[PDB]
Design a protein around this nucleic acid. Structure first.
Ligand SMILES: Cc1cn([C@H]2CC[C@@H](COP(=O)(O)OP(=O)(O)OP(=O)(O)O)O2)c(=O)[nH]c1=O
Ligand SMILES: [Mg+2]
Ligand code: NA
Ligand code: NA
Length: 332
DNA sequence: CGGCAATACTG
DNA sequence: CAGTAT
DNA sequence: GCCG
């Protein structure tokens, strides 16, 4: 009795197989660095299964029946169960390649491809990357420029303060608008790499053109250090940026502002609350098991044999016939 | 053996 | 398009 | 890497 999709089972903040799941997630990460999203995904699913188990895996046989556990995931677990360590995992963690790809990929703007190219070229440090400025995307120039701040875990108190500045901004334009903290904090975490906010208003349309003015406002306060505006397919609805959060005298924080109509707020909240892996299993389950496709705006039937609406996340869970799981249980 | 979540922007 | 972000 |  272990549902296959992570959106069918609870995934709490703290569980009973930390050592084991971290081992699998390291392989998932390593595969990622080797550009194998297939293997990364499979390891990630096994790790997710472990986070869900009601108690620690004492015997290698408690694995029997558990989905997503092939020969490879199985050998790794077994090895940690007897000797309390896995060689494949330790060699990965100690290897020069894994350690560098990790360091490079935590720089905002740097992904696996860029990281690999730089690695193959013999580059090994952030300072080596800074010496070649006329090569870096603006996203990366920013990541390197505020590297220290962006690496410092964000605290709930930083999230609070930002919510104060955002709500004040929104208040200068749209009275009665609501700003909701999403992302990991909504899931109960104490830290994050950034802060996510979802804005909306009860009256449809009363929120159009909101973001630009909110940004213009933050801009006048001279807090915007970087930004990128998005528009769903001025007049943009999403803002991915870095703000100078005063308190050093200030600290740079990544912030993502999302403006959504209240008709589709339940889908916006659902997508932006995560976890990341939770979204994937959710959307995958929507398709592979329900012929429908889910996104940040709504649920859709390729064939207009049915249309969808929702008032809360609970509604969206009904439409997919999934037992509800509050934010805190989506840490997949 | 094919699929693996679904979108938006920069360069 | 290639690559990175959520 | 695991699955249908
Ligand atoms: C990266 C990513 C994220 N999401 C959703 C689901 C989560 C929210 C917030 O993202 P974040 O990585 O900060 O996640 P968060 O959980 O807040 O992590 P931190 O605590 O900040 O590290 O966005 C997604 O659908 N697809 C993706 O590829
Ligand atoms: Mg976050
Ligand atoms: Na990065
Ligand atoms: Na984010």
């Amino acid at each position: 009795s272990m549902p296959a999709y992570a959106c069918q089972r609870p995934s709490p903040l703290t569980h009973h197989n930390t050592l084991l799941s971290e081992a699998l997630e390291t392989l998932a990460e390593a595969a990622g660095f080797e550009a194998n999203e297939g293997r990364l995904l499979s390891f990630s699913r096994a790790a997710s299964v472990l986070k869900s188990l009601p108690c620690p895996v004492a015997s290698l046989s408690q694995l029997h029946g558990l989905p997503y556990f092939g020969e490879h995931s199985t050998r790794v677990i077994q090895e940690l169960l007897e000797h309390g360590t896995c060689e494949e995992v330790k060699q990965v963690r100690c290897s020069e390649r894994y350690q560098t790809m990790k360091l490079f990929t935590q720089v905002f703007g740097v992904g696996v491809k860029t990281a690999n190219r730089w690695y193959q070229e013999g580059l090994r440090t952030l300072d080596e990357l800074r010496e070649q400025p006329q090569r870096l995307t603006q996203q990366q120039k920013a990541g390197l420029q505020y590297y220290q701040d962006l690496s410092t875990p964000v605290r709930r108190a930083d999230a609070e303060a930002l919510q104060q500045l955002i709500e004040a901004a929104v208040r200068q334009t749209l009275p009665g608008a609501t700003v909701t903290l999403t992302g990991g904090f909504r899931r109960g975490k104490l830290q994050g790499h950034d802060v996510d906010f979802l804005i909306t208003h009860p009256e449809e349309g009363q929120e159009v053109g909101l973001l630009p003015k909110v940004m213009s406002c933050l801009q006048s306060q001279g807090l915007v250090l970087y930004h990128q505006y998005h528009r769903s397919h001025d007049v943009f609805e999403r803002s991915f940026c870095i703000l100078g959060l005063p308190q050093p005298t200030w600290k740079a924080v990544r912030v993502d502002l999302v403006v959504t109509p209240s008709s589709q707020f339940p889908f916006a909240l659902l997508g932006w609350t995560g976890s990341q892996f939770f979204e994937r299993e959710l959307r995958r389950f929507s398709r592979q098991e329900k012929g429908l496709w889910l996104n940040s705006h709504g649920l859709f039937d390729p064939e207009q044999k049915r249309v969808f609406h929702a008032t809360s996340e609970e509604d969206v869970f009904r439409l997919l016939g999934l037992k509800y799981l509050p934010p805190e249980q989506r840490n997949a």
